[PDB]
Amino acid sequence: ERVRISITARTKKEAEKFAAILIKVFAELGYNDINVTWDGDTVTVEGQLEGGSLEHH
């Protein structure tokens, strides 16, 4: 149940503005404890849920 979202913005300031929102969306979704990892000019958010799966068969 790991969720990872990568945003490609022009500058760090631009991507940062998006990360702020993503953090709230993840927190409100129960994906608290998010970890952001940037490499070069791309930022990717990594979150994990402690209660959410799509069981089947």
Place this chain on the structure above:
Amino acid sequence: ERVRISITARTKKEAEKFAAILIKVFAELGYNDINVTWDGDTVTVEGQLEGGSLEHH
């Protein structure tokens, strides 16, 4: 000023749940008219900006 965000979820339903939110954030940010492009099992949102400005209607 092109902003693109790619989310990697387990199932389509999972990613779709995130897309809905991203769409709202983009619209409120002035990035109205967003285009989503999925290929295989990955969904990526594509939005554009028509300049900051502080106008209104």
